[PDB]
Design a protein around this ligand. Structure first.
Ligand SMILES: O=C(O)CCc1nccs1
Ligand code: NA
Length: 330
């Protein structure tokens, strides 16, 4: 089997991407944030505290003929940005892009934190990291990918995120029309439950490439690129007037700037992030200070190749017995 679904940026900044997902019988379509940095499929639901719902579409298990309570199971998750959610669990049929899984754990939120409530465009998350991170207790559950993988033509999914445009998540196949050149594959460690890999270095603009190992995760659920402070300082030093601001929460720069590109290594291959991708616009409406898309990972405890990096590439998440990541230009 295969599946193919379009993923759409939630706003003009590409802050996140939503992908329609069919849950239940008859189908209930919810727009979920596919997150390769977590392992829970959770939804706004008929159980979610009413004051914590503001515009989301909800899953109502009582209206699905295939829903069953997973008796005694609960979940609770905290993300890197301080957001959180928790609740109980149903099993139901879940389809993405024509690929169907029966018996998928659908984590129904009873509580969500304020950021979730305030984002009317995201109806929940679909985790695509390794199932070792799934938070369901007392019986840990599998991701949608882990449950599908019995069935896929090839044990893979691909992320093809757009810059200010829709893109695609495919399951079970490589679309050889979706990228240019060749895919460069690189080793993955599953020891922390993430798609963790080691970049071979970086360059700033038209500068020389610095060969250096940068461990980090491929995380579609994180907006920005978080790298070591040395790397990030070297980038922003090439932008007139760029500074790290304590009060704003990171590096800012004059909106009148033209930003340099940023290159990262994947083995002997290179992925170039255009400067434009690193612009996250005014820090507040009407400001001439703009927020940078490359930020320090110091204090976060891991480097994160988030959407700023991933949307410059066609990315293969290879879930074979020995997992690997692949990157191609596009
Ligand atoms: O131009 C603005 O609106 C803020 C300028 C800044 N002052 C301090 C941090 S960022
Ligand atoms: Na922000």
């Amino acid at each position: 089997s295969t599946g193919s679904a379009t993923t759409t940026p939630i706003d003009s900044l590409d802050d996140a991407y939503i992908t329609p997902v069919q849950i239940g019988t008859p189908a209930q379509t919810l727009n979920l944030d596919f997150d390769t940095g977590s392992s829970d499929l959770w939804v706004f639901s008929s159980e979610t505290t009413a004051s914590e719902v503001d515009g989301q579409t909800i899953y109502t298990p009582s209206k699905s003929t295939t829903a069953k309570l997973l008796s005694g199971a609960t979940w609770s998750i905290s993300y890197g940005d301080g957001s959180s959610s928790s609740g109980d669990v149903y099993t139901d049929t879940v389809s993405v892009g024509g690929l169907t899984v029966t018996g998928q754990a659908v984590e129904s939120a009873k509580k969500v934190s304020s950021s979730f409530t305030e984002d009317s465009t995201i109806d929940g998350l679909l985790g695509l990291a390794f199932s070792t991170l799934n938070t369901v207790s007392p019986t840990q559950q599998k991701t949608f990918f882990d449950n599908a993988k019995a069935s896929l033509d090839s044990p893979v999914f691909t992320a093809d995120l757009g810059y200010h445009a829709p893109g695609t998540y495919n399951f079970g196949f490589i679309d050889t029309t979706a990228y240019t050149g060749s895919i460069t594959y690189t080793a993955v460690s599953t020891k922390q439950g993430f798609w963790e890999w080691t970049s071979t270095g970086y360059a700033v603009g038209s500068g020389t490439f610095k060969s250096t190992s940068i461990d980090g995760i491929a995380d579609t659920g994180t907006t920005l690129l978080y790298l070591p402070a040395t790397v990030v300082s070297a980038y922003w030093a090439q932008v007139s007037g760029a500074k790290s601001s304590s009060s704003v929460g990171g590096y800012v720069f004059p909106c009148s700037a033209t930003l340099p590109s940023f290159t990262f290594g994947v083995g002997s291959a290179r992925i170039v992030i255009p400067g434009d991708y690193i612009d996250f616009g005014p820090i507040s409406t009407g400001s001439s200070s703009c927020f940078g898309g490359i930020q320090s990972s110091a204090g976060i405890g891991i480097n994160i190749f988030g959407d700023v990096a991933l949307k410059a590439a066609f990315v293969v998440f290879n879930g074979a017995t020995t997992p690997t990541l692949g990157f191609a230009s596009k």
